[PDB]
């Protein structure tokens, strides 16, 4: 939609929505296995997982369904592997040891983190504050690396191998406009 210039870039709300439209693992608290009951029979999600379910077992559901069940007492969200101190330590060591490469990291970076820290507060084995501080440190390091890399802006192309969604979005308008200006200057000069 138009809304002034909101037709060119995504709003942060749209980013959160598109991220939360993703699968995740869950440990259910209840059971609705069919009596060998109302069918879930959704249209944009495999209902076999939701229908054929039993408590204290691992299964995969979309993130918003998991959040809805977490609002009730029917859910226990399983934390991902990269939300722990021992993985973040080797990650930060990787960025510090490599002053030119963006570290490998899922593009849902910072967003799943925000959502899980907002809602799934009590299910983490590690203390929340330490994880938040480590995430902040990673954010600072990647910000420094982005500023270091932006110093050159060719008119032909550019490469950014491991930037997350929000980092790309918050930088899109400035980079786009500057590159367009340079390109049109060169085109008018020839």
């Amino acid at each position: 939609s138009l809304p002034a210039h909101l037709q060119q870039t995504f709003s942060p709300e749209e980013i959160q929505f598109i991220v939360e439209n993703e699968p995740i693992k869950i440990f259910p608290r209840i059971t609705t296995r069919q009596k060998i009951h109302t069918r879930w029979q959704l249209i944009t999600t495999d209902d076999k997982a939701l229908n054929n379910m039993v408590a204290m077992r691992s299964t995969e559901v979309v993130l918003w369904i998991a959040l809805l069940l977490k609002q009730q007492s029917k859910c226990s969200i399983v934390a991902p592997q990269w939300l722990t101190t021992k993985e973040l330590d080797r990650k930060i060591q990787y960025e510090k040891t490599h002053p030119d490469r963006f570290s490998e990291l899922p593009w849902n970076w910072l967003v799943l983190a925000r959502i899980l820290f907002n809602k799934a507060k009590d299910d983490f084995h590690d203390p929340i504050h330490e994880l938040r501080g480590k995430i902040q440190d990673l954010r600072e390091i990647r910000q420094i690396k982005v500023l270091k890399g932006l110093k050159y802006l060719n008119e032909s192309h550019l490469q950014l191998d491991n930037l997350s969604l929000l980092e790309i979005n918050e930088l899109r308008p400035f980079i786009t406009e500057i590159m367009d200006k340079l390109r049109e200057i060169h085109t008018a000069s020839l």
Partner: protein, 204 residues
């Protein structure tokens, strides 16, 4: 000579800033058609002068170079004046469609400027035609989708809502809401978006 025309265009720029800084559709400024009709009068004088000059050129006593250069200058004058006027009107129509598209095509005369008399009569009939188009657009194959609804993605199912203005009781599907002044509701998000857009509810 078209310098006065610039005086219009510059003013239009300020209007865009009013559109820009607010980032909201409200209080479109009152028009400036007096300067426009002054420009129209002077360009009519220009056209009459051009026709006279062409008459003398066809008569034979006028030099060809003088006639052609005067014709070029006058044509540039008309082109620039038309450019200025169209630049004004394009932005006016754009902002008109902008606030017409989001208020369900009713122009919200019950609540935004009140009389809308700062718009020209031609602009007002254009607004009515665009409201007609908006009404017709959702009457086709998209009848089951509210195109003029909210554009913020749905994020939660239940929200707290605080009453802003007093009313009676309003029926909903399977239930009814009585709008007592200064009351707080714990209801579904997608059942009060129409009221929130109208401004009757607050504290989303």
């Amino acid at each position: 000579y078209g310098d006065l025309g610039n005086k219009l265009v510059l003013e239009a720029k300020r209007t865009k800033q009013l559109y820009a800084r607010s980032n909201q559709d409200v209080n479109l400024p009152m028009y400036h058609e007096d300067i426009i009709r002054n420009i129209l009068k002077e360009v009519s004088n220009l056209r009459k002068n051009t026709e006279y000059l062409k008459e003398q050129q066809q008569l034979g006593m006028l030099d060809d170079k003088v006639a052609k250069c005067q014709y070029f200058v006058t044509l540039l004058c008309m082109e620039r004046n038309k450019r200025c006027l169209l630049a004004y009107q394009r932005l006016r129509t754009d902002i008109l469609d902008s606030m017409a598209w989001n208020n369900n095509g009713l122009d919200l005369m019950s609540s935004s400027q009140q009389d809308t008399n700062n718009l020209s009569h031609q602009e007002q009939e254009y607004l009515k035609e665009y409201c007609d188009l908006i009404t017709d657009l959702k009457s086709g194959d998209l009848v089951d989708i509210d195109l003029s609804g909210s554009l913020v993605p749905p994020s939660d199912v239940f929200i707290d809502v605080r009453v802003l203005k007093d009313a009676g009781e309003i029926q909903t599907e399977y239930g009814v809401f009585n709008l007592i002044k200064d009351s707080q509701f714990f209801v579904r998000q997608s059942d009060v978006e129409r009221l929130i857009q109208q401004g009757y509810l607050q504290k989303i």
